[PDB]
Structure 1
């Protein structure tokens, strides 16, 4: 069973730079039976390389393939914001096996989050639930802190969140935080705030609404 080990786990480089990805195999694999794939969040894998160095139809020449035996390489000569994806190696000398993947991040000039806050709708509140939303929009890096305050009191154990993957055109991230209270608990309080800490902020940002 040929094991494919990729290096590094995560790679972060700015546009114009060269990316080097490595693949290590448990068996000597002939270089005429090895492929490389690109997978952008939610898409199907795109064949980049086949036969270790043969470029697939519709692939840019900045994508270069190399290697032999157990040591294989993918080189991306000139990074674009569009190259933010996971890369995979595959051997096809025996029944096809693939690597664990390499996540390539494109660097961007530090961007502060455009922060928004949304109250629960009357329609929702009629169900017995009061969910409160906070949006951090178009920022870089992905690291960001979100704190929920109810009458200026830090909540915890109720706040779920998720983040979109790096934008393939502008390389930014966005974050959705959801404070889920009950209607009854929502109605015990009146001040709802979302505090955001981030690299592009010289000081923390707070957005809020009142009522009730």
Structure 2
């Protein structure tokens, strides 16, 4: 079957000016019969195409900063960034072109590290305008938190809601390095009118214990 490239870690928090190290391992040897090892490193910035940094293990691609260096032993590989800058932030991918089909690792996100920040949590009932129309969206906002990991749990009269909500998260903030998250719970007007307590429970590393924000209609 196809060669599997496994990257580590999944997410790498650094401070600007730190050294960064990222790993990629291959389920097969990537040594070609021609003596070369076709293991390549890319950086993808948000909304941009992947950009080639290192090719065939350690060859710095012409015009890539000297602070990027590639190393490794035929199946275990490492990308090092000696002095991390803001231009270096994004997702790093390894890929192999030794054996068809060519394959990619799952990516490692290089992001800015900051102190834990508990989310500010806000809940919005559906508007009367929307209820007229026939739907009820309840929105819970988790504002300016770090790290990214957050659990939102919707409860309607203590009934745990499952499968009827969708979440969306911003990219890390340019200034404060936080994330924000919106979660929408969709109900029918009929169902929304049948219940009283709408609760958004938020679990985050930065909080003492999970916080709940609710309203009663």
TM-score with structure 1 setting the length: 0.77
15-24 vs 87-96, greater mean Cα deviation: 87-96
Contact 1:158–1:181 (CA under 8 A) maintained in structure 2: no
Structure 1 runs of 4+ aligned residues shifted over 6 Å read none
Alignment partner, residue 193 of structure 2: 187
- After superposition, residues 189-204 of structure 1 pair within 5 angstroms as 189-204=195-210
For residues 71 and 157 of structure 1, the distance between their equivalents in structure 2, rounded to whole angstroms, comes to 41
Matched, 1:98 2:100: no
Tell me how far apart the structure 2 counterparts of residues 195 and 121 of structure 1 sit (CA, whole Å). 21
1:66 pairs with 71, 84, 90, which one? 71
Match of residue 139 from structure 1: 145
**How many Å separate the matches in 2 of 1:198 and 1:38?**
29
Q: Does the CA-based 8 Å contact 1:4-1:89 persist in structure 2? A: no
Partner of 1:78: 83
Unaligned regions of 5+ residues in structure 2, if any? none
Counterpart secondary structure, 1:126: helix
Matched with 1:38 is 43
Q: Deviations over 1:40-89 (max 9, x none)?
A: 35432111123433333553332112346445431122345664533222
Aligned residues: 210
- Give the equivalent residue in structure 1 for 2:212: 206
In structure 1, runs of 5+ residues without a counterpart are none
1:152-185: per-residue Cα shift (whole Å, max 9, x none)? x243225423242652734433322222221012
The answer to whether the Cα contact below 8 Å between 1:49 and 1:55 also exists between their aligned partners in 2 is yes
